[PDB]
């Protein structure tokens, strides 16, 4: 069992995109930005607690941050973790 303090820090934002919108409509899957060190177990627990839905499965990937020029100086955006959270059939978040 994961402490509530931990669960309140793992979910960072909903991820908005065409692929995310299609995932929700076709496969009942929400796409979230999650903490870099979040595990599938933590993400599942956090979604079930905080959004009050029933989770089938969590798939995760790490998005590597893009290298970007601001003026002349080179910079790099941060890596971040994306979670595809599949909800049970009749949950309707």
């Amino acid at each position: 069992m994961i402490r509530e303090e931990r669960l309140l820090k793992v979910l960072r934002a909903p991820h908005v995109s065409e692929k995310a919108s299609t995932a929700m409509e076709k496969s009942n899957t929400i796409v979230l930005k999650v903490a870099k060190d979040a595990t599938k177990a933590e993400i599942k627990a956090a979604v079930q607690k905080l959004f009050e839905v029933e989770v089938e499965v969590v798939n995760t990937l790490v998005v590597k941050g893009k290298v970007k020029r601001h003026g002349q100086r080179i910079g790099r955006r941060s890596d971040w973790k994306k979670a595809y959270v599949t909800l049970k059939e009749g949950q309707n978040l």
Binding site: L8, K9, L11, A13
Partner: peptide, 9 residues
């Protein structure tokens, strides 16, 4: 921490 979560969302 709950307030912090809701504001973040």
């Amino acid at each position: 921490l709950r307030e912090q979560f809701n504001l973040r969302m």
